[PDB]
Design a protein around this nucleic acid. Sequence first.
RNA 1: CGCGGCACAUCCACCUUGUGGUGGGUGUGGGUAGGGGAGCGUCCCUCAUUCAGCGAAGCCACCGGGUGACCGGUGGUGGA
RNA 2: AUGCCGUGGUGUAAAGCGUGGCAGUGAGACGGCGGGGGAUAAGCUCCGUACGUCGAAAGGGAAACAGCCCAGAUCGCCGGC
RNA 3: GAGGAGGGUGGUGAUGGCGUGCCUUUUGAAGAAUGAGCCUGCGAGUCAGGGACAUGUCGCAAGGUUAACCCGUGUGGGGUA
Lengths: 100, 59, 124, 146, 22, 56, 77
Amino acid sequence: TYAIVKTGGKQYKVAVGDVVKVEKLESEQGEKVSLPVALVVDGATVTTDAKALAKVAVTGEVLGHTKGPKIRIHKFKNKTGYHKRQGHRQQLTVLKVTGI
Amino acid sequence: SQLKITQVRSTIGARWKQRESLRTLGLRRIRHSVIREDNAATRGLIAVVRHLVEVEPAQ
Amino acid sequence: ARVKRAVNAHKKRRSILKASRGYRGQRSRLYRKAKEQQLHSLNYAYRDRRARKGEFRKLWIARINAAARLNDITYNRLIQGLKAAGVEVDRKNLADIAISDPAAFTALVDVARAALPEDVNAPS
Amino acid sequence: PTYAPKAGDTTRSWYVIDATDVVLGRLAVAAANLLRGKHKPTFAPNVDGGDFVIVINADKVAISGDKLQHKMVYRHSGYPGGLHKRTIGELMQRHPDRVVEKAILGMLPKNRLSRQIQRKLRVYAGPEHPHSAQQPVPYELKQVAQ
Amino acid sequence: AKRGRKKRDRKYSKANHGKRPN
Amino acid sequence: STKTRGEVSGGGRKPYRQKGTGRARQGSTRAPQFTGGGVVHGPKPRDYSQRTPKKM
Amino acid sequence: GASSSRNGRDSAAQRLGVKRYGGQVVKAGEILVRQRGTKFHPGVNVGRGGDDTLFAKTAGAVEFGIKRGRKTVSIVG
RNA sequence: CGCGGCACAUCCACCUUGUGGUGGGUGUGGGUAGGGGAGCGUCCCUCAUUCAGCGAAGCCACCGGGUGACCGGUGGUGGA
RNA sequence: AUGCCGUGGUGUAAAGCGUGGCAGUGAGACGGCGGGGGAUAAGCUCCGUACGUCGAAAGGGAAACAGCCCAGAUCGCCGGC
RNA sequence: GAGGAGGGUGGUGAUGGCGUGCCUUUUGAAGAAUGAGCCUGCGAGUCAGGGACAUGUCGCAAGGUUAACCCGUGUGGGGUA
Ligand SMILES: [Mg+2]
Ligand SMILES: [Mg+2]
Ligand SMILES: [Mg+2]
Ligand SMILES: [Mg+2]
Ligand SMILES: [Mg+2]
Ligand SMILES: [Mg+2]
Ligand SMILES: [Mg+2]
Ligand SMILES: [Mg+2]
Ligand SMILES: [Mg+2]
Ligand SMILES: [Mg+2]
Ligand SMILES: [Mg+2]
Ligand SMILES: [Mg+2]
Ligand SMILES: [Mg+2]
Ligand SMILES: [Mg+2]
Ligand SMILES: [Mg+2]
Ligand SMILES: [Mg+2]
Ligand SMILES: [Mg+2]
Ligand SMILES: [Mg+2]
Ligand SMILES: [Mg+2]
Ligand SMILES: [Mg+2]
Ligand SMILES: [Mg+2]
Ligand SMILES: [Mg+2]
Ligand SMILES: [Mg+2]
Ligand SMILES: [Mg+2]
Ligand SMILES: [Mg+2]
Ligand SMILES: [Mg+2]
Ligand SMILES: [Mg+2]
Ligand SMILES: [Mg+2]
Ligand SMILES: [Mg+2]
Ligand SMILES: [Mg+2]
Ligand SMILES: [Mg+2]
Ligand SMILES: [Mg+2]
Ligand SMILES: [Mg+2]
Ligand SMILES: [Mg+2]
């Protein structure tokens, strides 16, 4: 069995026991989250219906909060003297799927 | 009545009376909508800028 | 106070030359040529982080289109069918079901084919 | 992460395409889509997927009567005045397999990997091919209706 | 005079809308 | 204290002709871009006393 | 080559014309119409001027009119 | 448009109600010449404090951190 | 017809104005529309245009392609229109 | 940890896409315009002055402030011209 869960404006194909990095949720480590689904597959049944899928939730457990890789930006246009240095670390959440 | 004006195209390359008429209607970017009244000063603004907006008689 | 330059100046020289390891020729060896190439490498990287969002979508659509034609429908009317049936699964996962579970992808085509109108060429 | 095929995942089969009353354009498209693997949902643009394609009856292909007369095939030798030209009609007399093969190679990508894709293509002028040790399933042009 | 005429006919494409530089 | 280009010893003549040598034109051997030339905007003897008022 | 030895010259533009339009509120002394000749004539509370300069004699509002074919400028106090 | 980080202007709330801080809306944030603002690193002096022949500087490598200039840890070399 | 000046309404934060500090610029280019010079030639040359873009503008389209068409890049995403 | 299965560092990169060096100077340069073989070290808005204008800030305030000079071990005290 697996579900397609919707979180952070993006979708993820998850099963019970999977570890997923998602966007930063405002929940602390050890708590529980309820997340909406877009499709649920249980073998040969696909359930595919907004009246039915709005009653099915995925239960997640927060493992903690990690960071993205370091991204380095050095903008440069050709013969201008224009330079701009910038860095970024995206903030993530690690999430064990327990529900479906 | 009361009109709904949605901006469809860009102000890049538009002229001064076309950009300032979109500024007085309250539009900011593409697909931004606004609700305004159907008085004579409003559809004179719409007549200037009707190639850049899509009007519908909505609530 | 006469100040020697080398303790300050070698700081950015060591970091440019470490970012250029694995370049060939003068581009991993010489600081002036390693730095011209780091300007291009971080512009190319910026340019390609915004391009691969379209590149992976171009990969997924190609695989949804291949799997739909096995199930005698085009990509064209499949996307119309899933919007008509209210299936909000994105193309990242629709090209992932098409590989790992081909039976569930056949079950999604039948939902898309049923919600499609009776004559698709008739006006709305 | 999306699916990327490993080394040892691609399963290659054998197809035979009868070329009796098919126009040269429709056949070259269907052979190029079948050699690359555009019909499999595990397609990756850096991977030689796709299947073996045998084209029999290459002398029979539907070419128009004014294309046999007037369409030209140009080759240059690097020497001054090395522009040598034939027509389609007199290449179908000599090498009708080379006409079908040239139409497919212009429809493949222009890269190193298409050089390993074109090694899975066999074109024969007659109705008979030597690859009966494999079992080429016959392939017909299908158009998925819309 | 052929390069001028050929570079000037390519402004009547669908994307250029009757206009090009030069 | 340092020396400017007019105070370093020597350096009066033009060291070679300006055109025809394939070298950069130089004008003096004690210009600040040379080894051993004068210092540009270097230290000179200063007094740093200020005029702080009596009430302050 | 020949030359345009007979042409090539001009005087300065003199900034002539209507300076205050109709219904516009003026002060005493304000110049209304600057012109050669009387393209416009004075009316009530308007004087001509030395080089036909049509100023204001009284604060008021500018109004244009017709008085037997001639077009006049007047002030309504 | 969606989800998440930052910055600036303005508005609304307050905590010594602008020297400021916190919170919440809306708006804005391509940029050469150029203008304004705020910072990083090297060196010397003064006051305070703290390391160092149980190994300072400088150098080399690996692992890490910051919105940038850049930083820190650990080890090798080394000798104030 | 437009444009211009005045005035009454309504709209619209980063409009306008006065006086100080510090500037840079004063070689423009092509495209649309109106005109002169030239042969109603020029990737010509000189003006007009609360016209546009480039200059100083990345991204998508025009095969390639400063000035054309779409659109103005705070950063991240293996989302969607 | 003996070998394999899964993950993870570090090195490498078959293959696919995209992709016209840096500076200076220009309407516009990847340009077949200019400068640069390479590395290390050096090489360009400073200083004087009771100067000038404008500002931030501190002291005194209808007043503010001394110059040369004098006395002191000094950065302190005198000194109204
Ligand atoms: Mg430039
Ligand atoms: Mg390498
Ligand atoms: Mg996109
Ligand atoms: Mg001398
Ligand atoms: Mg000399
Ligand atoms: Mg010396
Ligand atoms: Mg004193
Ligand atoms: Mg005149
Ligand atoms: Mg007189
Ligand atoms: Mg922007
Ligand atoms: Mg900016
Ligand atoms: Mg600047
Ligand atoms: Mg030791
Ligand atoms: Mg030292
Ligand atoms: Mg370090
Ligand atoms: Mg150490
Ligand atoms: Mg050490
Ligand atoms: Mg000013
Ligand atoms: Mg000029
Ligand atoms: Mg100049
Ligand atoms: Mg001009
Ligand atoms: Mg013209
Ligand atoms: Mg010209
Ligand atoms: Mg023009
Ligand atoms: Mg562009
Ligand atoms: Mg602009
Ligand atoms: Mg472009
Ligand atoms: Mg392109
Ligand atoms: Mg769509
Ligand atoms: Mg030139
Ligand atoms: Mg310029
Ligand atoms: Mg060159
Ligand atoms: Mg060259
Ligand atoms: Mg040279």
